[PDB]
Each structure stands twice: as C-alpha cells, then as structure tokens.
Nucleic acid binder design. Sequence first.
RNA 1: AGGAGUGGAGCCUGCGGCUUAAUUUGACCAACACGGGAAACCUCACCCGGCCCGGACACGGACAGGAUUGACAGAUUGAUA
Length: 108
Amino acid sequence: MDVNTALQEVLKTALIHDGLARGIREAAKALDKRQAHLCVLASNCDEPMYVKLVEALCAEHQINLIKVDDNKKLGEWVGLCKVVGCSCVVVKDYGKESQAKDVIEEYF
RNA sequence: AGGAGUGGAGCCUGCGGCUUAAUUUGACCAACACGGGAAACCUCACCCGGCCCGGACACGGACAGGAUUGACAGAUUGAUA
Ligand SMILES: [K+]
Ligand SMILES: [Mg+2]
Ligand SMILES: [Mg+2]
Ligand SMILES: [Mg+2]
Ligand SMILES: [Mg+2]
Ligand SMILES: [Mg+2]
C-alpha cells in the first residue's frame, strides 16, 4: 500500500464522486474558497511561479500537499485520458472513506 | 310559362394587367368570397437588414501550463443582438 497507490485510488474515487478539481485555476479557486481538504502537485512542471504560487497558497490555507513526479502521469490518474497532463490537482471531497484515504492521512 | 335576378351605379372582395425592393404563390363547365386565403406583428412562403446553430455521430488536430462559455462599461447598432 504505497503512497502512490493510495493517491491513485483516492483520486479515482474523487473523480467517480465528482470531488476533484483539475487545473491551477480550479485548484486556486477551491483553495481560496476555504474548501478542498487536500492538494496534489507535480514536480515535472517547469514554470517556477506555478509551483511558487501553489505551495504558497497551500501553506497559507494550511492544508496537506504532495509532490508527485510526472504531470502526464498525474493527468492520466485524474482522468484526462491521449493524456492532457495535469500539473496541479485539488480534492474538494472524498466520495467514501477507504484504506487509501487512511494511508494518505497517515503519510500526512 | 314565369319569378327573382346578374350584366348598368357606388362599394366589398377574388383574378389578370400595370407599378414595385417586394407587391410571395397555386388554380384559367370541372380557375377567379377557391386554397377553409377576413395577412397590422405572427401567419409568411416575398423584399431590406441583423443575431443564432437547434452542424447528430465517426475520425484527426488543439487542449486542465485551460478546448471553450458568458458578460459590465465606452464605442457600435434600428436594437439593452
Ligand atoms: K343588374
Ligand atoms: Mg355590376
Ligand atoms: Mg356537369
Ligand atoms: Mg386585416
Ligand atoms: Mg407580415
Ligand atoms: Mg417578420
């Protein structure tokens, strides 16, 4: 039960329950709205202001953050599949509690 | 054999012609108050001008580092499209 597998399962559940906000604009709106318990970041993105703003907003809202490696893999996980490639995700809510969610909380 | 008429008058209404941006069009005993057709808009088919897609689905491309949607004001417009 690796943290990668836990993230994949929780993202799949959130998408199936429509609790996922993909993209930097949607993620920023969800974070500023005092919602969206968790956030996922991709280390592949080459834009420095991107990661700077993502981390600054996440820290200001005081919510968990995860830095995954590949933007394309993150997009394929969040369900943009040819994969567009998501470089920042937000979990507005989880559909149902699961062992993957528990593992993510423990990693937090 | 007759009665009431029509054809004459004014008007209503349909048809041709003429005119027009358009005067939408069908029909010439068995067409012409016929299309149940008494049209201000709609009807609308015609003319002038301006929005919209309400172009399914398939394939390909562009895309969450955003494909795309809508919009306040001021110009613009017949118009608060
Ligand atoms: K007469
Ligand atoms: Mg007469
Ligand atoms: Mg006969
Ligand atoms: Mg009338
Ligand atoms: Mg009319
Ligand atoms: Mg009209």
